[PDB]
């Protein structure tokens, strides 16, 4: 991609620059000026960018980010090279495979989307991997747009023990986040952005519960729960048992079909009721 | 008696010859029977062996190769039989006793059935409804004959001398050449067909 597009669509930098805001763009411009990278070069595709700028790119980006309050710009990872052309970082392959599997193109079923994803992992099906990279770019842009819409309208409201955000059918890209895995990843990115961009200290230490429509025929909603976002989080989640205990106490119509217990399907009418129980259960 | 390796060698030689010859070549009952028998014996022997072995898999791969070659050869012969059935049957009918046959007994039965089936179909569908004097179609003239003036690539197995190349109908233009062992030539099949029959050349 282009360095500008990558900076705008990476939840880390996008959250720390508050690019959903109006001053975030100015902060990004200040960052690039501190780097000394011409705007026209950073807006060009990375492959086509002048090689002289690439010599020390990682070190200079790390230094500038350190000046701007980001200390974790660098991560230990792996890359694979073959041929003259083909070079990939591990996270690129992960994102491409995820996008192939959770594709919104409904012409193909999900078992059909699984087959595409599995095929892409073989070097004989390289075209599938590149197609997945394009799909990943689209998905990242959609994620940032949804995060901006949620944060600008104050859709993340704190109940006592947890934060609650609900997606509505009027949302443009809602269709891309109806599938549970996409919704879970979106909820995690949204919590990171919210924690970076909020003022209340209490709301920074809360977990998140997120709901999005699933089927307009049966009036079902997918509900996900994720734990608080902290730099040293144990990554442990208590929402599966809490959900099962709320549904039992309130007699709602919940379905556990995901292999993760923190993703549930709920009857929309019960939703309100459900939540109150959950509140009373966690407070 | 041929060694099995020589038997497979002759199988491959006949395979390629039939693959490039414009006509049905001579039947080779001994090759087919011996190869089928070898496959049967190998299958029986493997039945006595344990399933997990590497040796069993290697044997099975070799048997698959041999089976493919035999099947392709027989398919080629069957295609030629179906394409030229009236002429194949006519040649078999008038064959001298000494001269070798171009059909195995089973191929002959297949060809006779093919001819009878096609003739009965043509009679029952259209020809019986035509005017009385148009009811007989001579299949011998309706079906085209093999074109023996086709050009082929060949490799010389045994040296041959004084081969007459005829470029056209005019005799004055004809000349003579020598075929050396190991050499490769492009020539009309009619000139060299007996050498393919005897095994002096191999069609490639």
């Amino acid at each position: 991609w282009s360095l500008h597009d990558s900076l705008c669509n990476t939840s880390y930098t996008a959250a720390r620059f508050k690019l959903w805001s109006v001053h975030g763009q100015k902060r990004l411009q200040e960052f690039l000026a501190d780097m000394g990278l011409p705007l026209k070069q950073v807006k060009q595709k990375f492959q086509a960018m002048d090689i002289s700028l690439k010599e020390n790119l990682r070190e200079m980006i790390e230094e500038s980010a350190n000046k701007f309050g980001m200390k974790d710009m660098r991560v230990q990872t792996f890359s694979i090279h073959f041929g003259f052309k083909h070079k990939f970082l591990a996270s690129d392959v992960v994102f491409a495979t995820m996008s192939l599997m959770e594709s919104p193109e409904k012409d193909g079923s999900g078992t059909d989307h699984f087959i595409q994803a599995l095929d892409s992992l073989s070097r004989s099906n390289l075209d599938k991997l590149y197609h997945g990279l394009e799909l990943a770019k689209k998905q990242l842009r959609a994620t940032q747009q949804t995060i901006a819409s949620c944060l600008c309208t104050n859709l993340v409201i704190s109940q006592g023990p947890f934060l609650y955000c609900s997606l509505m059918e009027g949302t443009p890209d809602v269709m891309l986040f109806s599938r549970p895995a996409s919704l879970s990843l979106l909820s995690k990115h949204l919590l990171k952005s919210f924690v970076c961009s909020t003022k209340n200290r209490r709301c920074k230490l809360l977990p998140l519960v997120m709901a999005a429509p699933l089927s307009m025929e049966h009036g079902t909603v997918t509900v996900v729960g994720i734990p608080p976002e902290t730099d040293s989080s144990d990554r442990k989640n208590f929402f599966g048992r809490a959900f099962e205990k709320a549904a039992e106490s309130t007699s709602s119509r919940m379905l556990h079909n995901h292999f993760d217990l923190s993703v549930i399907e709920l009857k929309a009418e019960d939703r309100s009721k459900f939540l109150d129980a959950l509140i009373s259960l966690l407070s | 008696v041929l060694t099995p390796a020589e038997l497979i060698e002759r199988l491959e030689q006949a395979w390629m010859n039939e693959k490039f010859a414009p006509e049905l070549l001579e039947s080779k009952p001994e090759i087919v029977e011996c190869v089928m028998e070898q496959l049967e014996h190998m299958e029986e022997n493997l039945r006595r062996a344990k399933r997990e072995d590497l040796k069993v898999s290697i044997h099975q791969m070799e048997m698959e190769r041999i089976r493919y070659v035999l099947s392709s050869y027989l398919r080629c012969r069957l295609m030629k039989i179906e394409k030229f059935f009236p002429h194949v049957l006519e040649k078999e009918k008038t064959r001298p006793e000494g001269e070798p046959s171009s059909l195995s007994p089973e191929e002959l039965a297949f060809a006779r059935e093919f001819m009878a089936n096609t003739e009965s179909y043509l009679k029952n569908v259209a020809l019986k409804h035509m005017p009385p004097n148009l009811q007989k179609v001579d299949l011998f003239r309706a079906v085209p004959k093999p074109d023996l003036d086709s050009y082929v690539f060949l490799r010389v197995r045994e040296r041959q001398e004084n081969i007459l190349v005829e470029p056209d109908t005019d005799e004055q233009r004809d000349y003579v050449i020598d075929l050396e062992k190991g050499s490769q030539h492009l020539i009309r099949y009619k000139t060299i067909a007996p050498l393919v029959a005897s095994g002096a050349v191999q069609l490639i």
Binding site: - | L78, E106, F110, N117, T118, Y121, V125, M130, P131
Partner: protein
């Protein structure tokens, strides 16, 4: 004159990939009716030529005879080309034809196909000691003993060995011997996965 038979020929010529169109019953009947009409007119002319000794009619008799021969040639060529396509069906699909393909064939063509199928089975049985050799298999040179196959459509139980079978459902994958999967791959039921 022979334009109806020309239509018969053109229909087949327009499909040079071997597909079987619907049998042209009405065209064939038209050609046969024209042939009968030509024959009757020629018969009247021949009788008059004998009776009155009119030589001037001979060219007309020759013209009609040539037209009759042309009609016969076109009819026979049409039928024979259809037979060739039907024959290819056996080696491309198998012994049991899809009903879609059966629909295009005439009943007499189905009888011809059944007879040919029986003859081919007999010949294939006669090659070897037991069961002979089924030369409709092994259409390509073999590479590996086992292959990976993906189900392109729901097919149900499929026998691997007499003891054991496997259920073919869409988008499942199986690692199986090639000689048991070749036929279903050629029929479009399985897909060969290379990795």
């Amino acid at each position: 004159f022979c334009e109806k038979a020309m239509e018969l020929i053109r229909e087949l010529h327009r499909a040079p990939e071997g597909q079987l169109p619907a049998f042209n019953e009405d065209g064939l009947r038209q050609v046969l009716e024209e042939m009968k009409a030509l024959y009757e007119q020629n018969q009247s002319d021949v009788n008059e030529a004998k009776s009155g000794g009119r030589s001037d009619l001979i060219p007309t008799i020759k013209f009609r005879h040539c037209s009759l021969l042309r009609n016969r040639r076109c009819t026979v060529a049409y039928l024979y080309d259809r037979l060739l396509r039907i024959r290819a069906l056996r080696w491309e699909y198998g012994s049991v034809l899809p009903n879609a393909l059966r629909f295009h064939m005439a009943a007499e063509e189905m009888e011809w196909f059944n007879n040919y199928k029986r003859s081919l089975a007999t010949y294939m049985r006669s090659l070897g000691g037991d069961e002979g050799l089924d030369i409709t298999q092994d259409m390509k040179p073999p590479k590996s003993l086992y292959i990976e196959v993906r189900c392109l459509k729901d097919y149900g139980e499929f026998e691997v060995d007499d003891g054991t079978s496997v259920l073919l459902k869409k988008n499942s994958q199986h690692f199986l011997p090639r000689w048991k999967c070749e036929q279903l791959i050629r029929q479009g039921v399985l897909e060969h996965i290379l990795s």
